[PDB]
Structure formats: structure tokens, C-alpha cells
């Protein structure tokens, strides 16, 4: 049985610009058990029907995980635009897998703001699918070199979520797991 709890029940989650990935292989994935295990607010799939998942075999599955605003879970999908999909975590158009999310306000908010969760705001170009950009190089928006410092046309490229427990629901923190269903090679992850 696939060790999904190692991803879903992780104590701390990555920031979306620094999204984490766990390869899952050589195990039986039971998604009806996963679905009924928790109070997921998003459980959607692509290239596969959510309700026919326990008869599927794949070579590997990758579990990527990070924290974003509830109003940004809609960007975690193929064909989406927006700062999250463009600069932080990008799915290919032909993505096969599921996107799962839940409200984490009770874990990830802090009175006076939790500023640990970050996202990228500036980038010279959009991410390719599954690209991961951790750079903190000052973004040069104009023709003048920035010399590693902020200033005119020179921007620190990351921004903090200010997760407070009183935030509106669109602005509360959501933990997200993206399960990527890869099939190249003998299959090592099957439903029951």
C-alpha cells in the first residue's frame, strides 16, 4: 500500500515556489481510502475519471505538495494562467493525474500573520511544466543592472502570503497534493 500519509499528513508543507516532490512506486494506491480519509475540499483529476481510479496501473506516481491560497487552487491544473501557474508550479496541457487540496487554516495560519509561505511574483518567463525555480536573484525589470539590491526597476522576486486565521476563505492557506500518473516500462503502482 502506497505511503500517501507521508505526503498528505506531513507536519510542514513547502512554499509553492519551492514545491516538494515524492516519487511513489511499487505499491497499491487505494484512492477510495485516500478520499474518505480526510475532508478534502478539492479532489479533481485530468486524463482519468476520478471514479474509475482503482482499476489503473502506472509506472510511477509523483506527489508534489505545497501551500497556496484557496483562491489559487483553480490555477493548479492544465491550461491555467496566473502568477501561480506561470511562475510557481506549472502542469503540462496533457497532464494525467489528480489535484487534491484542503483548507489548512488551523495548521498554517498564525496570529499576526504567518510569513513563512512564499510565492514568486516576478520572472523573466513562464515556467515549463514541472519546472522548479528557487532563485532569489533580484529581478531586473529595466535596462539598469540591479547589483544584487532592490531599487528602480529592481525587484526582489518573492512575496509572502500573510496567512492570518481571520482571512476570508479565498485567502486562507490550502495544502495541495498533485499526484502525477506517469506511464512510460512495467507498471509498479496499481489500484486494488
Amino acid at each position, epitope marked *: 500500500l502506497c505511503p500517501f500519509g507521508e505526503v498528505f499528513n506531513a507536519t510542514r508543507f513547502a512554499s509553492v515556489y519551492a514545491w516538494n516532490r515524492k516519487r511513489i512506486s511499487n505499491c497499491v494506491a487505494d484512492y477510495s481510502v485516500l478520499y474518505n480519509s480526510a475532508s478534502f475540499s478539492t479532489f479533481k483529476c485530468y486524463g482519468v475519471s476520478p471514479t474509475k481510479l482503482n482499476d489503473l496501473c502506472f509506472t510511477n506516481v509523483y506527489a508534489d505538495s505545497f501551500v497556496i491560497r484557496g483562491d489559487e487552487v483553480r490555477q493548479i491544473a492544465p491550461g491555467q494562467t496566473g*502568477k501561480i501557474a506561470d511562475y510557481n508550479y506549472k502542469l503540462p496541457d496533457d497532464f494525467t493525474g489528480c489535484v487534491i487540496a484542503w483548507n489548512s487554516n488551523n495548521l498554517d495560519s498564525k496570529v499576526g500573520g504567518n*510569513y513563512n509561505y512564499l510565492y514568486r511574483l516576478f520572472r523573466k518567463s513562464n515556467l515549463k511544466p514541472f519546472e522548479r525555480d528557487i532563485s532569489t536573484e533580484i529581478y531586473q525589470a529595466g535596462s539598469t543592472p540591479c547589483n544584487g539590491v*532592490e*531599487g*528602480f526597476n529592481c525587484y*526582489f522576486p*518573492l512575496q509572502s502570503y500573510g496567512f492570518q486565521p481571520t482571512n476570508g476563505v479565498g485567502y486562507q492557506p490550502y495544502r495541495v497534493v498533485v499526484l502525477s500518473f506517469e506511464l512510460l516500462a512495467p507498471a509498479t503502482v496499481c489500484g486494488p
Partner: antibody
Amino acid sequence: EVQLVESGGGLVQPGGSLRLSCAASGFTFYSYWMTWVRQAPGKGLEWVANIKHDESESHYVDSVRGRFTISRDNAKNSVYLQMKGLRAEDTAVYYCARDGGYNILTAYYHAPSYWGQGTLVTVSS
Amino acid sequence: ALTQPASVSGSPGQSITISCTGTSSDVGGYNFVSWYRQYPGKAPQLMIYDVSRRPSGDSDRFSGSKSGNTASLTISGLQAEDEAEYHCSSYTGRSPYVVFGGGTKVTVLG
């Protein structure tokens, strides 16, 4: 080059409504804070409103609270100032500007940098 | 909100200095003083930011400094085309998130 093309404005009576807009090109609009500034005739500049790159935050000078709404449409690279209950003291040239903003992570503020050409708002009975 | 002279004059070639006095919660509280030049009927143009930094070579004759709650802008090698209004400003970290002085008219004596 950066362009901020201002639209809207004109003449209304007290209690009337206006909407200003600023259309941006030459920079990645949804990465930047936007700011509105006004200038009554023969007077200096006055800060009016600002809005975060993601609308998650917007601020207003006290005398326009509950009468002006700042907003933005990132898909259209535009920022807007919706004005209701206009008073004569609101008569001014209004400028949209880029930045005006504040990064919590670095505690760095970028000054209003590129400015629209201005548009005249006249409130008169 | 900030205090600057209504007007200053200098002769061509000279340096002039425009002061801009605020309080501990703005000019004295940040290094976020900015100066704008504005010609009649035109939008402001950022000439100095972070008290003393230049966005471009257009500010090569401009310099800034700050002591206590007063900032200063100096224009050197004064030219006829420097006749304009100059606005100081500062971040406040509260409404108004940006404060301005009333503007200074620079006259180049002719």
C-alpha cells in the same frame, strides 16, 4: 517602453459618479502595485489609493473611504478608480502610477515610478 | 503633510537646495524619500528615490540627503530648463501610505 494610457474622467455634478482607468503595456502588469494620485489646480500631489498586484490589499486616503473603489483587471492589464458621491473638493487631475508599494519580505517600498498622462475630473454644480 | 518651500530661485550655473521636512513616522522613519519633477501640464517624473538614488542619467545633476526629519534635494549646474515644480514625498506605512509636500517652484533667474 512603459506606457500607461489613462481613460475616463470629465465633468459631473456633486453626488455624481466617474470611473478612471489606466491601461498598461511595456511591463508585466500583474507583478506590480498600482497607485492613484491627484492634483487639484495650483496645488501639490495627494495620494488617493493603491492596490496590490493581486488585489489582496488596497488602501485609501481617509476622505475617499466608502466613495472610491480601486480595482484591477490583470487579464486586461488595467487598473480602475471607481468614484461615487463625488464632491467639489474631488476636482483634480488624477494620475495612475506604477508601484507605490511595499514588500513585506524585504520591507522595501518602491516609489510611484511611471505615471499616466493624467485625466481631469471636475465636480461642479 | 510634508513641508517644502513654495519657491526657490538660483542663477544659471549655481547649485540650489530644496528642503523637505517631515516627522519621525516618514522622512525621519524610512530611507524612502522620493523627489519628482513636474513641468506644466505634465505628469510627475521620479528624479530621486531612497533619499539619494538616481533612476537614470537624467538625474545626474540631482543629489539627495537626509538628516533627522528633513530631506534635501540639490540641483547643480542650474539650467533654464530646470524651471519646474519639485515634489518631495515619503512612504509612511499607514494612510496616507505616501505623503507629499506642497511642491517647490524652481526659478532659474533670467
